[PDB]
Amino acid sequence: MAHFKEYQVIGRRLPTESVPEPKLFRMRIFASNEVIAKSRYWYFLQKLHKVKKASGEIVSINQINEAHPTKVKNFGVWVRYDSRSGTHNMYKEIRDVSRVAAVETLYQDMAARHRARFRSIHILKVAEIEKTADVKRQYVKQFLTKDLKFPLPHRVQKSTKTFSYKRPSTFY
Amino acid sequence: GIREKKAEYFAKLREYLEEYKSLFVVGVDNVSSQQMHEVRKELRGRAVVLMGKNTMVRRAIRGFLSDLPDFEKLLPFVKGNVGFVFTNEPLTEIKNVIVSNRVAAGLTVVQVYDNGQVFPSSILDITDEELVSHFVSAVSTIA
Amino acid sequence: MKYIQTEQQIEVPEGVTVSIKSRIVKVVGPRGTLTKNLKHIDVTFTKVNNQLIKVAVHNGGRKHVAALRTVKSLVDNMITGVTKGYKYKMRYVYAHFPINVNIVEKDGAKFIEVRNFLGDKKIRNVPVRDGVTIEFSTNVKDEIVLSGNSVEDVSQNAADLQQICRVRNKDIRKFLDGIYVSHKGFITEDL
Amino acid sequence: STDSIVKASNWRLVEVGRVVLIKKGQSAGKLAAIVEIIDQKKVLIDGPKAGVPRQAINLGQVVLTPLTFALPRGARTATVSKKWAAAAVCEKWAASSWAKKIAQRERRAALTDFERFQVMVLRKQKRYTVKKALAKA
Amino acid sequence: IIEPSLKALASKYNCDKSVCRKCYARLPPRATNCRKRKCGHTNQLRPKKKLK
RNA sequence: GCAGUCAAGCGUUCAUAGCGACAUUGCUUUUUGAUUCUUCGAUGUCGGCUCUUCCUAUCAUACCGAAGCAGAAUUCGGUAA
RNA sequence: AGAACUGGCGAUGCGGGAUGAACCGAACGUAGAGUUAAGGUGCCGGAAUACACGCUCAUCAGACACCACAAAAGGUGUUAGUUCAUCUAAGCCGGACGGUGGCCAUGGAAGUCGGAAUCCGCUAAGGAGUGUGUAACAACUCACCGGCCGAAUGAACUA
Ligand SMILES: [Zn+2]
């Protein structure tokens, strides 16, 4: 829950003489360190298969780096979450350079707008959106128009000293 | 569907072009509840009249760019609301039978369709007097 | 959601010249010249040609964006006011005591003065706003007509005249007396 | 007057090809180009020539300059270089007061104590010849 | 007395209005919500009542 | 004690002008209880008189919006102590 | 008011919670240097008027566990989301109507007091006159009305 890395977690049920070689399951988990990621792996597995980590084991844990960490992409994000009064699915879009960058703004946004802390959200799917205008959401489409430019009116420069011998301007 | 229904208008209209030789486009801008319509059964041994929603009516036209392109000349007269008399002859007598239904103050025609032409209508052939004395009137003026 | 740009357009007709500098707008036409301070809204003007000036908000939320059209309009009515002009018409309406209405002055001032309203011994006075000029129709009974370049000033001066005749303590559905706005439009260009 | 006059704020635009001066961080001091806009707050930049690594940056740690050059959006580092060079961006920058003051201020800061002393002595010389001028016309 | 058309004129002002049911505001006749903050901009409106 | 939400009903007709059942959310601390924390080597009961000040859930008075407001009279409501 | 297990207060200062028996931190010989806890760092006051993405404007905003209260119910305020439907065959401006006062009732009773159904139908508009005026004419004017229209749109909802 912080500056996110994304991990492959791969686990399985412990072998039995009856079933050596039990099936392997993978999740992609966003977390900040690997102790959290494996926790998170088990949290989800327990809600999906009978297994507690006391009957299972983690076979591999590997960080998945962004393939094109400077191509700008538009991501579709699918999320399940709890409100003070129920639980909701929700599709949002995020424009960024990496999943890991996108996911982090997802979490800030769920916090800002819906007052959803991390314990309350599940990431359902995160996906680069291939064709522009499969993009559904205005506030990301806006950036997709041709020869896009804008000013940044009213610039405030931070001052290094407490007094200034001239009245400042906001001119950019 | 409603694009079925859009298409539906398209479907039938094309069919009516391909079912008549003449066509009178009669303006049906304004004019409304019960009267004329009920005369039209009686006049439906000559024609089909169809009233309908305009953008739909226009897009029918777009679908007919494929052939019979002379209907393009109907196009500047699509405006407002117009309606059809699919037709064979007279365009200047039968037409006037169609016209007569009881005026309002001419109920209510303001445009003509005459197979690439747009008459009053009131002149089309009656004596061949634009083909024996006006197809040789500057042959008359100069031999 | 913040709209990265959003803009409106202001047609300048022949014969008028609008000039704007730090949101103080000066509009000049055949009828006269109006000015208006727009400093209370962050909008940016941009002249495309002399027929057409644009107004944008950059990176603005809803309520900001709502300010955009309204600036366009205000500036539009400046242009109309100084070409076609504004004219509002009113009617005296009274069931019994005829409402007796004149112009009077004090210190070269000018007031609309209203007498006998519902039989009142009191006299009502409404200052005539500068720029707005009062007539009385010749061939519509009980008419009163305010005109000028400023819809704002014409319309408010008409409002002042009607608000001054309200009828207190009576069922105002039965007692309908008043001076009411009866038509509103332009000086030039038919009626 | 008789033309409609409307002075319009001539803002430096965030746009592909806009060149920016990096305020903070490790690339502090260097020029990079906006390659692609991310949102109202972030952009992809790239400063191959100054050796600032193509990266997503927050506009608040950058300052827009008046310079801009032709660059197709999304352009990878290689073609950013080709274009930046074609355009002669550093040439233009160097020529600006802005870049000159930075240089001036940099040079002052490197002055030795002996050097500071010489500047004093030279200043006093210039002063002298100035005050007699400012006294004749 | 008072020609039909001026009675009508007077009524656009005096009677073709709706009324907030919480706070009583005289409101535009086609309004959906009360403009007043004291009643919470309620949309509980009724027509102003017509004379006899 | 005081105020709401729903609206079946009242109100010739018409839920909500004025009201409002079945239910239901609250507020107050001049009612009365419940408690027993302080005071039993002491804090002088009830009412009145006198006098000052404060609250507002406003009876009058100022200006308003509603009405089953024609007028007069009233009634509902706002800003108001 | 009364029990269960544990930890506390009572018997206990110290740092934080402005204040405060019982909360948080941490328990105590006399001191030096360093580091932290809980808690903080605009100014009162030691410590970034630090960095980052949003959200919020309150003619009664809000601001941090124990803790110094607020609910049902509402909002076309603004935010993000959901579902259904329309759309390359948002959304806007006008078309919403006849047979049959159809068939039971009964000024009327039609979709339009009330009973039971609502079947079919067709695609184009001048009220023997709204008023002035005449006992009544003349003149001007208006009624099932809209140009529609241009990658989104409509409705119902969640928080
Ligand atoms: Zn209200």
From Swiss-Prot, chain A:
Location relative to the cell: Cytoplasm
Phosphoserine: residues carrying this PTM: 32
Entry annotated with the keyword DNA repair: no
InterPro entries (UniProt xref): Ribosomal_eL20, Ribosomal_eL20_dom, Ribosomal_eL20_eukaryotes
UniProt main location, coarse: cytoplasm
The entry's keywords: Cytoplasm, Isopeptide bond, Phosphoprotein, Ribonucleoprotein, Ribosomal protein, Ubl conjugation
Additional comment: There are 2 genes for eL20 in yeast.
Protein name: Large ribosomal subunit protein eL20B
Curated annotation (Swiss-Prot), chain B:
Phosphoserine, modified sites: 66
GO cellular component: 90S preribosome; cytoplasm; cytosolic large ribosomal subunit
MF terms (GO), sorted A to Z: large ribosomal subunit rRNA binding; structural constituent of ribosome
GO biological process, any: cytoplasmic translation
Sequence segments annotated as region (Interaction with P1A-P2B): 121-143
Cross-link Glycyl lysine isopeptide (Lys-Gly) (interchain with G-Cter in ubiquitin) per UniProt, renumbered positions: 12, 95
Alphabetized UniProt keyword annotations: Cytoplasm, Isopeptide bond, Phosphoprotein, Ribonucleoprotein, Ribosomal protein, Ubl conjugation
Coiled coil: none
Superkingdom of the source species: Eukaryota
Compartments, as annotated in UniProt: Cytoplasm
Its biological purpose: Component of the ribosome, a large ribonucleoprotein complex responsible for the synthesis of proteins in the cell. The small ribosomal subunit (SSU) binds messenger RNAs (mRNAs) and translates the encoded message by selecting cognate aminoacyl-transfer RNA (tRNA) molecules. The large subunit (LSU) contains the ribosomal catalytic site termed the peptidyl transferase center (PTC), which catalyzes the formation of peptide bonds, thereby polymerizing the amino acids delivered by tRNAs into a polypeptide chain.
Family designation: Belongs to the universal ribosomal protein uL10 family.
Record-given protein name: Large ribosomal subunit protein uL10
Section covered of the full-length record: 3 to 221 of 312
UniProtKB/Swiss-Prot annotation, chain D:
Region forming the signal peptide: none
Major place of residence: cytoplasm
Protein origin, superkingdom: Eukaryota
A cellular component term, taken from the record's GO annotations: cytosol
Gene3D superfamilies found in the cross-reference section: 2.30.30.30, 6.10.250.2270
Keyword set includes Phosphoprotein: no
InterPro entries, per database record: KOW, Rib_uL2_dom2, Ribosomal_eL14, Ribosomal_eL14_dom, Translation_prot_SH3-like_sf
The record's account of how the chain is modified after translation: N-terminally acetylated by acetyltransferase NatA.
Intrachain disulfide bonds: none
An MF annotation (GO) of this entry: RNA binding
Protein's GO biological process: cytoplasmic translation; maturation of LSU-rRNA; ribosomal large subunit assembly; ribosomal large subunit biogenesis
Quaternary structure annotation from Swiss-Prot or TrEMBL: Component of the large ribosomal subunit (LSU). Mature yeast ribosomes consist of a small (40S) and a large (60S) subunit. The 40S small subunit contains 1 molecule of ribosomal RNA (18S rRNA) and 33 different proteins (encoded by 57 genes). The large 60S subunit contains 3 rRNA molecules (25S, 5.8S and 5S rRNA) and 46 different proteins (encoded by 81 genes).
Note: Present with 35100 molecules/cell in log phase SD medium. There are 2 genes for eL14 in yeast.
PANTHER family, alphabetized: 60S RIBOSOMAL PROTEIN L14, LARGE RIBOSOMAL SUBUNIT PROTEIN EL14
Descriptive protein name: Large ribosomal subunit protein eL14B
Organism whose genome encodes this protein: Saccharomyces cerevisiae (strain ATCC 204508 / S288c) (Baker's yeast)
UniProtKB/Swiss-Prot annotation, chain E:
Cross-link Glycyl lysine isopeptide (Lys-Gly) (interchain with G-Cter in ubiquitin) mapped to chain: 17
Cell location: Cytoplasm
Subunit structure: Component of the large ribosomal subunit (LSU). Mature yeast ribosomes consist of a small (40S) and a large (60S) subunit. The 40S small subunit contains 1 molecule of ribosomal RNA (18S rRNA) and 33 different proteins (encoded by 57 genes). The large 60S subunit contains 3 rRNA molecules (25S, 5.8S and 5S rRNA) and 46 different proteins (encoded by 81 genes).
Function: Component of the ribosome, a large ribonucleoprotein complex responsible for the synthesis of proteins in the cell. The small ribosomal subunit (SSU) binds messenger RNAs (mRNAs) and translates the encoded message by selecting cognate aminoacyl-transfer RNA (tRNA) molecules. The large subunit (LSU) contains the ribosomal catalytic site termed the peptidyl transferase center (PTC), which catalyzes the formation of peptide bonds, thereby polymerizing the amino acids delivered by tRNAs into a polypeptide chain.
Protein's UniProt name: Large ribosomal subunit protein eL40A
Organism: Saccharomyces cerevisiae (strain ATCC 204508 / S288c)
